[PDB]
Amino acid sequence: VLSEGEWQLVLHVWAKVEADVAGHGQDILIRLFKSHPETLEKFDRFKHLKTEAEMKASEDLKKVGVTALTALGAILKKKGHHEAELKPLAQSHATKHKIPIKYLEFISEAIIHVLHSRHPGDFGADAQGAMNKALELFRKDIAAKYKELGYQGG
């Protein structure tokens, strides 16, 4: 649904994330819990983490960060053809955890902020717009599987 060139911009900056998936996951997840702390309620196990340094020292949060980015990277590498990868993820997020689409929008803002905080030279306005379009595709399709399972997304 994006252009070939737009996916090349998405996958180019994603290459920068693969050089440090753990660090990126920590910054994204911490950025998510600082900007929208209601999302932290979806993590009973991160309740005892009061400070940003505690969060950065939680191996469990680092591991949860790598699991999500690993799945996001597998989805973006399909360049839109992600039905087989996006449906199990939707199920995990609906039936198990009830993650509203609004919360996938929050982490997307966190991703954008972090990617542009670390790699502005490889994340100008064309790259941002490309990535924003990849993430919107991912959210808009997760929400269709959500409905398909009977979960509206709120």
Ligand code: HEM
């Ligand atoms: C880019 C967006 C996201 C991706 C790619 C993603 C991906 C994943 C993946 C792959 C898993 C593990 C799947 C499994 O074993 O079944 C997972 C689990 C989970 N995700 Fe997400 N996720 C995203 C956003 C969110 C957000 C915003 C929240 C909550 C605020 C969330 C909460 C969870 C939770 C609670 C689990 C279960 C893990 C645990 O209890 O610690 N995810 N996610």
